[PDB]
Amino acid sequence: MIPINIKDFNYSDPVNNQDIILVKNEKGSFDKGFFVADKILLVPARYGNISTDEGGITSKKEKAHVDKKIYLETDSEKNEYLKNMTTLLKRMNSYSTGNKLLNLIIKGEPIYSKDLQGKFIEQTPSRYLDTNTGKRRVNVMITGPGSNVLTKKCTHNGMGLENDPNGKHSNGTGILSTIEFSPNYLIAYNKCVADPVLTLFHELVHSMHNLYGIAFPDNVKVPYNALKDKNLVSGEEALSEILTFGGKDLTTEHLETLWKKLAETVIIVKDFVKTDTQAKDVFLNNLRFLSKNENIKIDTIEDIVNGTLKIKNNISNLTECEFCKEIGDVRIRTRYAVHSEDVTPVEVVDFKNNYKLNSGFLEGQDISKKYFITNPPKMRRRALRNFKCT
Amino acid sequence: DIIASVDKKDVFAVSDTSYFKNFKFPSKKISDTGEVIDSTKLPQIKDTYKSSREEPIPDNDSTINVKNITTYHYLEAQKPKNSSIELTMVAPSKSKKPNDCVVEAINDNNKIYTPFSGTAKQFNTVVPIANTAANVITWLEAIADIFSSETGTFDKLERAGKETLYYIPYVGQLLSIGENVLIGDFKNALLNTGLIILLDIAPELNIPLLGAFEAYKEYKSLEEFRKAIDNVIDERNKRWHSVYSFVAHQWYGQVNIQIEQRLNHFYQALSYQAGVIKNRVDIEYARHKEGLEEKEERKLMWASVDCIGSIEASVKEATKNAEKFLEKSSILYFKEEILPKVHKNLEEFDKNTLFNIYTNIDEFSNRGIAEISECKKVEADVNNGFRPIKFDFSLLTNLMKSDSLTDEVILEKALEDALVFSLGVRNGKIQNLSKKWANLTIGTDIRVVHGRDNESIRLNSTQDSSIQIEKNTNLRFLDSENFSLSFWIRVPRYNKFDKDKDLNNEYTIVNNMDTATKGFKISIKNGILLWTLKGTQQKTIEIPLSNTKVSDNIWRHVAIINNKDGNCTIYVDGAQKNAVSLSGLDEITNTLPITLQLVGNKNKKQFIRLDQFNIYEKALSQTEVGKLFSSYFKDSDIRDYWGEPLAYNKTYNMINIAYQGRGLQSTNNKISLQPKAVFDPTGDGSYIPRLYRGYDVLLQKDSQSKTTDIMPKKDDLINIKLKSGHNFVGFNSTIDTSQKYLKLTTALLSEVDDPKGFKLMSLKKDNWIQIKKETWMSKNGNVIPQGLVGKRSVDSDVYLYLWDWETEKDDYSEKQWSFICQDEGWIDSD
């Protein structure tokens, strides 16, 4: 509903240092970054440290692994990736829940950091990512996949040091998140491929939680111990991303249970900010954006609690399954990580033609349609446990 | 030395218990706003960086040594290593145990183990001869026939005091589930050993609720304590759900993952047998492609296709049996070995909360009481609010492929498909329980309170207690088409306050128009509710919430159903009340979101409640609404005066049907009815009977009643005990003909022989409890026949008499009762 614009770019467009930038990466080179939406940075370059070896055995956590060096190495492929990503963001922007997620992701702002001297500093790694012309205002970064082409996860620079819910992404301090997403590679769940718009919405909800400092800690996950021993792990149940998912998966600390802390997180950050005015204003605006059209007050405890309740009610209906329910057309998997179910990575031959702005996969999401490469070029078959004795 | 190479996924997985052990449920001190937050002890903010990225852990194929043969060897022995005619199947028999047959199948490339001893004879023992096309079809049809019969078996299994579960006999000899020397050794292994056999790894779970609740002592106002103690009710209500999801999650991690592994092995093991048999048929077809007299490769070749089709059909149904056996058995493990553990702890916690609240009441009585009645007003909200919450088994079921009987709720396909929006409470949160989507904006002030089955939304009078439903693409049909609204609304009785603070002000309940804009409106006028339509001309239809069309605080299923532009019929119950013609109007087109708010009410003490606010695409027929209304009620539930189900340790006094307004009093030595006291509801020359009369009495599950359910049932006979003291409604040990109620209050000294066990139950299901007592061997040697409780009048004084009654053909009318529990919509005063 809210009028925002995302601008389509081309990798052939030149760097004007205004909307198209160069991002300094871990390798020390520079990747042509694009601002598809205000404070939303998108780079068609893959994540750092691409594996030199293809095939073999997947890691003990994930089930489906695909690797490809040649993926996203030519400017034509980077252009294709950029157009696919712009199309996905525009499609998600068309719907009301996607529009609410994009309003916050863009209008959000991490609160300023306190130096050793005690005064607040504006230019911080929490809000800026170094480029060749100095730093720049970023809220979320979208990249290509890592070594694992299938991977789709949201990572940041702020995490709980003592494996406890007090990380930079959980204590109300903002942080910017980097997302490694690939439109061209999809995991199929029970003979149907996931719609990439839903997975991108999942990752952006995680990014928004990280941005406002209200995220469920990612230091919480339940490992699965095959035959119940520590050394043998067949997979892990990351509560952090399940909760973001809708569906029917069973989790103890729900998202509605989450944000009870917000009352106390808001009190803590208000105490931490009280010294400065500008820092206070950002936090108050941040809070106004979290609780839709409020013009909040946080002077007393009762107003704080009312505001926290307003926020919970506002951003409780931003989930994968809720987005699907808004779409109606797209079919979503029931649970999230069925430990025992088989998954078939499918690649998309022609994303530009086979996927549209209005309704992608015009032949549906069945593995046997939209010429979906049942299994993609490379694989890494799962670890094979052998049982032997008399 | 047998080998068994299995996928990393397909090994049995059990969640680590470290996360769940560290999870704790702490004691809380609820305040006006909620839990007390003290910034003094709140942690200081740290702002150090740490990258979220965890490097993937390198993995490789590993070897595991197991002393005894495991299920994996039973699965490795059935995959066909050879794909030729030389392949033979091995089945267990008297010659060698199935644990011995598996090792002969692993070490050999040409043998497949198979628990089915029958289809082995047609495959291994019997081999076809490529001579004539007649004999092969007899062979080809037979191997499909016996396989279908062998894999399609579904034997009922029964246990003492537990739900009977249907099981598959051959799973024991298919996945090494247990000591399976005989095919039938699986059944007796399921009995006398439990459903632990289905799980490879014995699960370990947790006992929460190490803490209780309380109310803060820093209240300064009459309204502060009322708002504070209301928060304690909600906080306890939510914790009754959080523990349920915490325990349900623990069950999924520790039990249902193993079951999905066991069920997934059934997908594989049967597919191995289906593969080899289907492979044999293909080579059988090719093996008979020589010596053709023609028409034998067109006719009796489709039979080969028929054999192929029959094998897959049997396996598809056999998998359905596996889902109905194993996957149902997972819930039966939960209902027996997990749910009793958590229910005991929660009740123990809830008792501790009651002590704290009552202690807080005594302090509130000392300082700043209003002296309303015995210096305690909110005790009505406490017993009413502290109702046990049944486990919503829709949590487990949604995870499960089989259409389990645990659903046990059937709705009309036409009616269910016509549903568009269904507001309601699900696991203690407002949800849109429809399959469609609607933009619902839950207000801050809205609180969930106990209702008919699940909690009910309380539209309080406060400004921020509104629900907003946007008119999206799905809800655009309310413009020029038929639509039906259904909802359970409990409007509190027309009070003196309601009729004094306003006289003729008609304030909205559900608003969908603005001034000079079209829309539909639900409003209350001078204590009567009515449906409003704005079109070409505004049309207002009254709705009777009771006799004389005045609010009675009774749970009612108002259903403004018909908007077919021919008629507007309304069903306050299963029966139509009022109708109108809509020829005048043509459309209701508005962009204004559907609002549930009380706007314009002068009284600020009015609670309007809603439970299932539904919208339907069709103008439901008179037949449908009867089915819709009757769907809510079950033939097994018992409800109090207002339609809420009975609850143990809820204080409610009972009055008769014929003798309205007369409570229970103790005469010389019996139970009698006090003289009727009739009061003025509104204060204008009209008098109606009082409700809160007689003994304040509760009811508790009897010692002899095994059923471990939390709420009473049309069964589960329950002793009736006075709240005031250890007093039990019962009979004397020595009764001949004067079957009056001793109301002894004695079960201690020489009076243990008191028949205080009653069976409350409601035939017509209209909040009318009919207390049935079964025939018992009365002391002194007399046999007293079964019958309900009625009234018998001696002199000027009535009496509670046990009149004879056998079954429904007798006249149970005028022998019923209504249980009335306080509530803040019905005040019994001047």
mmCIF file with all atom_site columns, C-alpha atoms in Angstrom, chain A residues 34-144:
data_model
loop_
_atom_site.group_PDB
_atom_site.id
_atom_site.type_symbol
_atom_site.label_atom_id
_atom_site.label_alt_id
_atom_site.label_comp_id
_atom_site.label_asym_id
_atom_site.label_entity_id
_atom_site.label_seq_id
_atom_site.pdbx_PDB_ins_code
_atom_site.Cartn_x
_atom_site.Cartn_y
_atom_site.Cartn_z
_atom_site.occupancy
_atom_site.B_iso_or_equiv
_atom_site.pdbx_formal_charge
_atom_site.auth_seq_id
_atom_site.auth_comp_id
_atom_site.auth_asym_id
_atom_site.auth_atom_id
_atom_site.pdbx_PDB_model_num
ATOM 1   C CA . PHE A 1 34  ? 23.482 -1.646  -6.508  1.00 0.00 ? 34  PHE A CA 1
ATOM 2   C CA . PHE A 1 35  ? 20.840 0.138   -4.392  1.00 0.00 ? 35  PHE A CA 1
ATOM 3   C CA . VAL A 1 36  ? 17.683 -1.497  -5.816  1.00 0.00 ? 36  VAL A CA 1
ATOM 4   C CA . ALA A 1 37  ? 15.743 0.196   -2.989  1.00 0.00 ? 37  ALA A CA 1
ATOM 5   C CA . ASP A 1 38  ? 16.724 3.049   -0.638  1.00 0.00 ? 38  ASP A CA 1
ATOM 6   C CA . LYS A 1 39  ? 19.216 1.682   1.969   1.00 0.00 ? 39  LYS A CA 1
ATOM 7   C CA . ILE A 1 40  ? 18.842 -1.789  0.340   1.00 0.00 ? 40  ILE A CA 1
ATOM 8   C CA . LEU A 1 41  ? 22.156 -2.841  -1.236  1.00 0.00 ? 41  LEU A CA 1
ATOM 9   C CA . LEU A 1 42  ? 22.328 -5.652  -3.810  1.00 0.00 ? 42  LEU A CA 1
ATOM 10  C CA . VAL A 1 43  ? 25.563 -7.060  -5.263  1.00 0.00 ? 43  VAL A CA 1
ATOM 11  C CA . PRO A 1 44  ? 25.566 -9.769  -7.963  1.00 0.00 ? 44  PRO A CA 1
ATOM 12  C CA . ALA A 1 45  ? 28.946 -11.092 -6.711  1.00 0.00 ? 45  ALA A CA 1
ATOM 13  C CA . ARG A 1 46  ? 28.984 -14.379 -4.787  1.00 0.00 ? 46  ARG A CA 1
ATOM 14  C CA . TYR A 1 47  ? 30.059 -14.550 -1.126  1.00 0.00 ? 47  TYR A CA 1
ATOM 15  C CA . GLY A 1 48  ? 33.752 -14.835 -0.212  1.00 0.00 ? 48  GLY A CA 1
ATOM 16  C CA . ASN A 1 49  ? 35.903 -18.000 -0.292  1.00 0.00 ? 49  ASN A CA 1
ATOM 17  C CA . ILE A 1 50  ? 34.247 -19.982 -3.100  1.00 0.00 ? 50  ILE A CA 1
ATOM 18  C CA . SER A 1 51  ? 35.277 -23.659 -2.767  1.00 0.00 ? 51  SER A CA 1
ATOM 19  C CA . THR A 1 52  ? 37.769 -24.920 -5.401  1.00 0.00 ? 52  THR A CA 1
ATOM 20  C CA . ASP A 1 53  ? 36.468 -28.546 -5.140  1.00 0.00 ? 53  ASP A CA 1
ATOM 21  C CA . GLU A 1 54  ? 33.153 -29.675 -6.696  1.00 0.00 ? 54  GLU A CA 1
ATOM 22  C CA . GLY A 1 55  ? 31.233 -32.765 -5.543  1.00 0.00 ? 55  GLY A CA 1
ATOM 23  C CA . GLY A 1 56  ? 31.960 -35.082 -2.617  1.00 0.00 ? 56  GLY A CA 1
ATOM 24  C CA . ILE A 1 57  ? 30.006 -35.238 0.656   1.00 0.00 ? 57  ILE A CA 1
ATOM 25  C CA . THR A 1 58  ? 27.760 -32.563 2.148   1.00 0.00 ? 58  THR A CA 1
ATOM 26  C CA . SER A 1 59  ? 28.313 -31.098 5.637   1.00 0.00 ? 59  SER A CA 1
ATOM 27  C CA . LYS A 1 60  ? 26.740 -32.962 8.566   1.00 0.00 ? 60  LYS A CA 1
ATOM 28  C CA . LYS A 1 61  ? 24.136 -30.187 9.124   1.00 0.00 ? 61  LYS A CA 1
ATOM 29  C CA . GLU A 1 62  ? 22.450 -29.643 5.727   1.00 0.00 ? 62  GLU A CA 1
ATOM 30  C CA . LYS A 1 63  ? 20.888 -32.307 3.487   1.00 0.00 ? 63  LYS A CA 1
ATOM 31  C CA . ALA A 1 64  ? 21.153 -30.918 -0.064  1.00 0.00 ? 64  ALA A CA 1
ATOM 32  C CA . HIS A 1 65  ? 24.503 -29.353 -1.130  1.00 0.00 ? 65  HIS A CA 1
ATOM 33  C CA . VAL A 1 66  ? 25.329 -27.993 -4.616  1.00 0.00 ? 66  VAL A CA 1
ATOM 34  C CA . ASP A 1 67  ? 28.592 -26.235 -5.615  1.00 0.00 ? 67  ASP A CA 1
ATOM 35  C CA . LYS A 1 68  ? 29.599 -24.537 -8.893  1.00 0.00 ? 68  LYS A CA 1
ATOM 36  C CA . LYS A 1 69  ? 32.675 -22.325 -9.454  1.00 0.00 ? 69  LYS A CA 1
ATOM 37  C CA . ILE A 1 70  ? 31.523 -20.999 -12.865 1.00 0.00 ? 70  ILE A CA 1
ATOM 38  C CA . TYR A 1 71  ? 28.224 -19.760 -11.324 1.00 0.00 ? 71  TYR A CA 1
ATOM 39  C CA . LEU A 1 72  ? 27.966 -15.948 -11.178 1.00 0.00 ? 72  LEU A CA 1
ATOM 40  C CA . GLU A 1 73  ? 31.452 -15.216 -12.601 1.00 0.00 ? 73  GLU A CA 1
ATOM 41  C CA . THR A 1 74  ? 30.535 -13.434 -15.897 1.00 0.00 ? 74  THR A CA 1
ATOM 42  C CA . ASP A 1 75  ? 28.896 -10.014 -16.280 1.00 0.00 ? 75  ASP A CA 1
ATOM 43  C CA . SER A 1 76  ? 26.014 -11.590 -18.307 1.00 0.00 ? 76  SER A CA 1
ATOM 44  C CA . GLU A 1 77  ? 25.270 -13.965 -15.386 1.00 0.00 ? 77  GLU A CA 1
ATOM 45  C CA . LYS A 1 78  ? 25.537 -11.023 -12.906 1.00 0.00 ? 78  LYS A CA 1
ATOM 46  C CA . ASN A 1 79  ? 23.077 -9.020  -15.043 1.00 0.00 ? 79  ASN A CA 1
ATOM 47  C CA . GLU A 1 80  ? 20.685 -12.026 -15.115 1.00 0.00 ? 80  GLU A CA 1
ATOM 48  C CA . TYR A 1 81  ? 20.990 -12.368 -11.309 1.00 0.00 ? 81  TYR A CA 1
ATOM 49  C CA . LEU A 1 82  ? 20.347 -8.625  -10.785 1.00 0.00 ? 82  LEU A CA 1
ATOM 50  C CA . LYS A 1 83  ? 17.225 -8.626  -12.994 1.00 0.00 ? 83  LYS A CA 1
ATOM 51  C CA . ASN A 1 84  ? 15.885 -11.764 -11.248 1.00 0.00 ? 84  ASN A CA 1
ATOM 52  C CA . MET A 1 85  ? 16.489 -10.196 -7.810  1.00 0.00 ? 85  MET A CA 1
ATOM 53  C CA . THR A 1 86  ? 14.814 -6.890  -8.838  1.00 0.00 ? 86  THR A CA 1
ATOM 54  C CA . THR A 1 87  ? 11.819 -8.873  -10.204 1.00 0.00 ? 87  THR A CA 1
ATOM 55  C CA . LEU A 1 88  ? 11.568 -10.875 -6.936  1.00 0.00 ? 88  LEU A CA 1
ATOM 56  C CA . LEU A 1 89  ? 11.739 -7.698  -4.773  1.00 0.00 ? 89  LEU A CA 1
ATOM 57  C CA . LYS A 1 90  ? 9.116  -5.939  -6.917  1.00 0.00 ? 90  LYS A CA 1
ATOM 58  C CA . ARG A 1 91  ? 6.811  -9.007  -6.770  1.00 0.00 ? 91  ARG A CA 1
ATOM 59  C CA . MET A 1 92  ? 7.129  -9.120  -2.966  1.00 0.00 ? 92  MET A CA 1
ATOM 60  C CA . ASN A 1 93  ? 6.548  -5.305  -2.900  1.00 0.00 ? 93  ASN A CA 1
ATOM 61  C CA . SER A 1 94  ? 3.245  -5.802  -4.788  1.00 0.00 ? 94  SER A CA 1
ATOM 62  C CA . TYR A 1 95  ? 1.672  -7.535  -1.733  1.00 0.00 ? 95  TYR A CA 1
ATOM 63  C CA . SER A 1 96  ? 0.661  -5.827  1.525   1.00 0.00 ? 96  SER A CA 1
ATOM 64  C CA . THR A 1 97  ? 2.788  -7.917  3.936   1.00 0.00 ? 97  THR A CA 1
ATOM 65  C CA . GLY A 1 98  ? 5.792  -7.528  1.596   1.00 0.00 ? 98  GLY A CA 1
ATOM 66  C CA . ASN A 1 99  ? 5.131  -3.772  1.482   1.00 0.00 ? 99  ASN A CA 1
ATOM 67  C CA . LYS A 1 100 ? 5.151  -3.614  5.320   1.00 0.00 ? 100 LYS A CA 1
ATOM 68  C CA . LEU A 1 101 ? 8.401  -5.583  5.474   1.00 0.00 ? 101 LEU A CA 1
ATOM 69  C CA . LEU A 1 102 ? 10.028 -3.269  2.859   1.00 0.00 ? 102 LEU A CA 1
ATOM 70  C CA . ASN A 1 103 ? 8.818  -0.079  4.601   1.00 0.00 ? 103 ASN A CA 1
ATOM 71  C CA . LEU A 1 104 ? 10.557 -1.167  7.858   1.00 0.00 ? 104 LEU A CA 1
ATOM 72  C CA . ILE A 1 105 ? 13.729 -2.609  6.197   1.00 0.00 ? 105 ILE A CA 1
ATOM 73  C CA . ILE A 1 106 ? 14.224 0.771   4.418   1.00 0.00 ? 106 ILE A CA 1
ATOM 74  C CA . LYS A 1 107 ? 12.916 3.184   7.099   1.00 0.00 ? 107 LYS A CA 1
ATOM 75  C CA . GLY A 1 108 ? 14.779 1.316   9.884   1.00 0.00 ? 108 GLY A CA 1
ATOM 76  C CA . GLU A 1 109 ? 17.891 2.659   11.514  1.00 0.00 ? 109 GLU A CA 1
ATOM 77  C CA . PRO A 1 110 ? 20.413 1.061   13.877  1.00 0.00 ? 110 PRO A CA 1
ATOM 78  C CA . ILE A 1 111 ? 21.033 3.261   16.938  1.00 0.00 ? 111 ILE A CA 1
ATOM 79  C CA . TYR A 1 112 ? 24.416 4.976   17.307  1.00 0.00 ? 112 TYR A CA 1
ATOM 80  C CA . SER A 1 113 ? 27.370 3.336   19.059  1.00 0.00 ? 113 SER A CA 1
ATOM 81  C CA . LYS A 1 114 ? 29.002 4.705   22.236  1.00 0.00 ? 114 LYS A CA 1
ATOM 82  C CA . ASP A 1 115 ? 32.813 5.109   22.025  1.00 0.00 ? 115 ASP A CA 1
ATOM 83  C CA . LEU A 1 116 ? 35.294 4.841   24.967  1.00 0.00 ? 116 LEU A CA 1
ATOM 84  C CA . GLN A 1 117 ? 34.862 8.606   25.712  1.00 0.00 ? 117 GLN A CA 1
ATOM 85  C CA . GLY A 1 118 ? 31.055 8.083   26.160  1.00 0.00 ? 118 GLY A CA 1
ATOM 86  C CA . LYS A 1 119 ? 29.752 10.262  23.259  1.00 0.00 ? 119 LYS A CA 1
ATOM 87  C CA . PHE A 1 120 ? 27.835 8.723   20.336  1.00 0.00 ? 120 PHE A CA 1
ATOM 88  C CA . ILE A 1 121 ? 29.471 8.101   16.915  1.00 0.00 ? 121 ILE A CA 1
ATOM 89  C CA . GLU A 1 122 ? 27.353 8.132   13.720  1.00 0.00 ? 122 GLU A CA 1
ATOM 90  C CA . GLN A 1 123 ? 29.756 6.360   11.261  1.00 0.00 ? 123 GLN A CA 1
ATOM 91  C CA . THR A 1 124 ? 29.843 2.787   12.646  1.00 0.00 ? 124 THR A CA 1
ATOM 92  C CA . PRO A 1 125 ? 30.208 -0.725  11.186  1.00 0.00 ? 125 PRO A CA 1
ATOM 93  C CA . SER A 1 126 ? 26.648 -1.432  12.516  1.00 0.00 ? 126 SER A CA 1
ATOM 94  C CA . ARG A 1 127 ? 25.245 1.094   10.012  1.00 0.00 ? 127 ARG A CA 1
ATOM 95  C CA . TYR A 1 128 ? 27.946 1.478   7.290   1.00 0.00 ? 128 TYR A CA 1
ATOM 96  C CA . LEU A 1 129 ? 29.938 -1.000  5.121   1.00 0.00 ? 129 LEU A CA 1
ATOM 97  C CA . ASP A 1 130 ? 33.301 0.345   3.752   1.00 0.00 ? 130 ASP A CA 1
ATOM 98  C CA . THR A 1 131 ? 33.511 0.971   -0.059  1.00 0.00 ? 131 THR A CA 1
ATOM 99  C CA . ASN A 1 132 ? 36.289 2.425   -2.304  1.00 0.00 ? 132 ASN A CA 1
ATOM 100 C CA . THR A 1 133 ? 35.003 6.054   -1.816  1.00 0.00 ? 133 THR A CA 1
ATOM 101 C CA . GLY A 1 134 ? 34.619 5.608   1.982   1.00 0.00 ? 134 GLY A CA 1
ATOM 102 C CA . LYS A 1 135 ? 31.573 4.165   3.808   1.00 0.00 ? 135 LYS A CA 1
ATOM 103 C CA . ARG A 1 136 ? 27.891 4.286   2.768   1.00 0.00 ? 136 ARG A CA 1
ATOM 104 C CA . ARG A 1 137 ? 24.425 4.067   4.388   1.00 0.00 ? 137 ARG A CA 1
ATOM 105 C CA . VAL A 1 138 ? 23.297 0.386   4.209   1.00 0.00 ? 138 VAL A CA 1
ATOM 106 C CA . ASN A 1 139 ? 20.516 -1.520  6.025   1.00 0.00 ? 139 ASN A CA 1
ATOM 107 C CA . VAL A 1 140 ? 20.507 -4.891  4.245   1.00 0.00 ? 140 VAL A CA 1
ATOM 108 C CA . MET A 1 141 ? 22.957 -6.469  1.759   1.00 0.00 ? 141 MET A CA 1
ATOM 109 C CA . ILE A 1 142 ? 21.899 -9.145  -0.757  1.00 0.00 ? 142 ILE A CA 1
ATOM 110 C CA . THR A 1 143 ? 24.630 -11.284 -2.345  1.00 0.00 ? 143 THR A CA 1
ATOM 111 C CA . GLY A 1 144 ? 24.993 -14.479 -4.327  1.00 0.00 ? 144 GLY A CA 1
#
